């Protein structure tokens, strides 16, 4: 139970918690109530794990993209500014904020990829990205290079593919279609060709990581970096006097970064969400109350217009914001997962040589679309599974594969029907092992190998951990089991399925049994 009468915040340690500590100390002062900051490690997996079972803090501070996951677990509240209180901010942060039609958070700050470029090798920043092999060469004559950032990471090198036209996921009808992903398209190919030719150029390194760039950036060996301003204290403190603007266009058109949004949710269980409304509004969503914070971490754009066109003093937050609105708000489903495993491996192997831009992308677009269908197969298996003992779950011949697999699991709990239920009674299930005792009994099914018998143990026992979850008041972890079954078939069962006649061997080996 989270008490009442004061307001428990988490925030990241990265963050000025001491400064947000200064607000909830004014907010003590005037009001009397109890304000409480806590930075614990690892929060963002934390909070979904204290929260499943109604408790944890009153608030909590994280990136927009984390919440989505969030709220369909039902683990925040659904904040009600008024119309009066919305135009103070913003309106594109307000719809990194929102899921299912709903607002689910309170826009704190704005955080994107920008152009970092040293003053001193390179006093006029290029505006394109064609202008930089060019620029390069004069570099190289006085031991320097142009450009140097992480490309082991999708995220840094995504705006450059996505200028001509590459996207992510299709957003329609307040809803991301996870089946229409653009990394197979033109705009996605061509700004990938541009990454490798800067590559096969030598311009760049294919091994170039984080640490890798940082450091070359950070002692004045390349004129100009790719980064957020997660990375400012780092050249604060190096001799490097550096400038932040926009990243370069591509054919003309503007680099597309996704852009992070720090947003305050409320905990769904907290029994003080008016006085977190309250904070949140009056105290900390002010001039002074984003100011106390600032001075102590920089929040670099936040999304209060009275104070963002205050610290846009600083050409830095002004290029930050303005990269923000040429890029896109980064989607908010789980499902992204999915997408940046798929486009790591294919910048790697592009960039590497062992594949061509085409196919790299190529497979991108189907590890994608398989991810899909695999979560489609998880989903309905857990659906039927909870509907089987009454609970409903908010998340005939092309349904064959599916009403196959939900047959043979009720077959394999029919016939050991008193070892599970001796099972599911003795189970050690908590929100903070749930993936442990997850992952260990999967290790065990497949550890001799795998074969159609243990995939269907393997999808009967996420559906015994997802019942016993709701049984006992832990339904969120229900999501997380979703996920977490969908990802081990992704990731290890999918190229034995294929390999093995794919599901509609599976249909062909047990259809004759269910007669
Ligand atoms: O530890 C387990 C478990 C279940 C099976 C298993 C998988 C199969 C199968 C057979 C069995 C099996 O060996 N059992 C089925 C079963 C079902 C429900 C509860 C317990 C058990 C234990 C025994 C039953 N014994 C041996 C056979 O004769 C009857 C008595 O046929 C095709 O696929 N296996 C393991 C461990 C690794 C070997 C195979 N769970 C587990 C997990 C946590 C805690 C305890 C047991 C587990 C994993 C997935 C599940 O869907 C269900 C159980």
Redesign the pocket.
Known sequence: KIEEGKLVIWINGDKGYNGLAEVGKKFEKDTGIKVTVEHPDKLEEKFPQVAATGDGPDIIFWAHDRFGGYAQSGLLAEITPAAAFQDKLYPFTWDAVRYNGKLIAYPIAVEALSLIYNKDLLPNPPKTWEEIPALDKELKAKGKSALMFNLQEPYFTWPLIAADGGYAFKYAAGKYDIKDVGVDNAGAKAGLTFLVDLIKNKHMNADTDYSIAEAAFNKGETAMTINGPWAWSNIDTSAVNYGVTVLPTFKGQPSKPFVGVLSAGINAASPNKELAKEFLENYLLTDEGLEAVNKDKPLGAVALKSYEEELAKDPRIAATMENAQKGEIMPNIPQMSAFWYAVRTAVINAASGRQTVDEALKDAQTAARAAADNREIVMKYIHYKLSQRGYEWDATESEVVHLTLRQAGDD?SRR?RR??AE?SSQ?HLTPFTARGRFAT?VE??FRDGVNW??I???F??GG?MCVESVNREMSPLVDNIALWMTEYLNRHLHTWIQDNGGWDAFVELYGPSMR
Do not use: H, K, T
């Open positions: 394999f050991y070892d599970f099972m189970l009994v065990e099914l018998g243990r269907v143990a393997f009967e026992f015994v």
